[PDB]
């Protein structure tokens, strides 16, 4: 028997929406440790011989995120249901509801890890976004608010 | 005592956030009912027993009214 704030999970995002989430999210990959290194060696080669803009990539530490929700930096939040201590995230869907930040429980904790160069992630969030995908994001958000927030208004109740 | 403990906006929020997220423990689950039927008089009695001192229970029963009153109306 499950208390309502637990298994506010398991009522995750659907198939078509989920893929489209990653359709967006895989666009915002953090640079890999290999890539970052070569980039800088490319700089060193150049800057030893003879401008850049701030780079959008998704945000991924639980800390960093819980910072970001509640500070309004966050736009969309992705929260994996299966986590070793569930308690490590149980507050998180409510916090977001309270700061009005759009959130979706995604299925597959490893599946978050994909989009972020790590083994797992528990939580990732897309804070800032490119100009072209700005509309793509805000629509996804709405899609999520329909099929997840409005569909499961009774997720805060029922055991 | 100069750094006593001014409320802080963040911490206040968290306390209440957790207060609502967790729900209510069995003695408190009994306690809110003991307010709604038998009155604040009999409510404090069990609270004083269930915790240590009266001062603890008093501040506890006062937190109970804050929950019940803010829940039904707002």
């Amino acid at each position: 028997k499950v208390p309502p704030t637990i298994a506010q999970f398991q009522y995750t995002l659907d198939r078509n929406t989920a893929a489209e989430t990653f359709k967006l999210f895989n666009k915002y990959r953090p640079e890999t440790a290999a890539e970052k290194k070569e980039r800088l060696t490319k700089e060193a080669a150049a800057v030893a011989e003879g401008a850049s803009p701030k780079p959008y990539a998704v945000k991924y530490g639980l800390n960093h995120v819980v910072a970001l929700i509640e500070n309004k930096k966050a736009k969309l939040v992705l929260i994996a249901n299966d986590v070793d201590p569930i308690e490590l995230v149980v507050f998180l869907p409510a916090l977001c509801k309270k700061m009005g930040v759009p959130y979706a429980i995604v299925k597959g904790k490893a599946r978050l890890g994909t989009l972020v160069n790590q083994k797992t992630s528990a939580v990732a969030a897309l804070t800032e976004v490119r100009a072209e995908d700005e509309a793509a994001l805000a629509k996804l958000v709405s899609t999520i608010d329909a099929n997840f927030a409005d569909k499961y208004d009774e997720v805060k109740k029922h055991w | 005592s100069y750094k006593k403990g001014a409320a802080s906006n963040r911490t206040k929020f968290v306390r209440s956030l957790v207060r609502e997220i967790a729900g209510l423990s069995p003695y408190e689950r009994r306690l809110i009912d003991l307010i709604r039927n038998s009155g604040e008089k009999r409510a404090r009695k069990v609270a004083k027993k269930r915790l240590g001192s009266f001062t603890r229970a008093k501040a506890k029963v006062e937190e109970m009214n804050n929950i019940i009153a803010a829940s039904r109306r707002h």
């Binding site: 309270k98 805060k156 029922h158 055991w159 | 207060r19 609502e20 707002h74």
Partner: peptide, 15 residues
């Protein structure tokens, strides 16, 4: 034993 979690605090969004 199994009351619905009445969200007495998240009802009102923070500005």
């Amino acid at each position: 034993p199994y009351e619905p979690l009445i969200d007495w605090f998240t009802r009102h969004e923070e500005v």
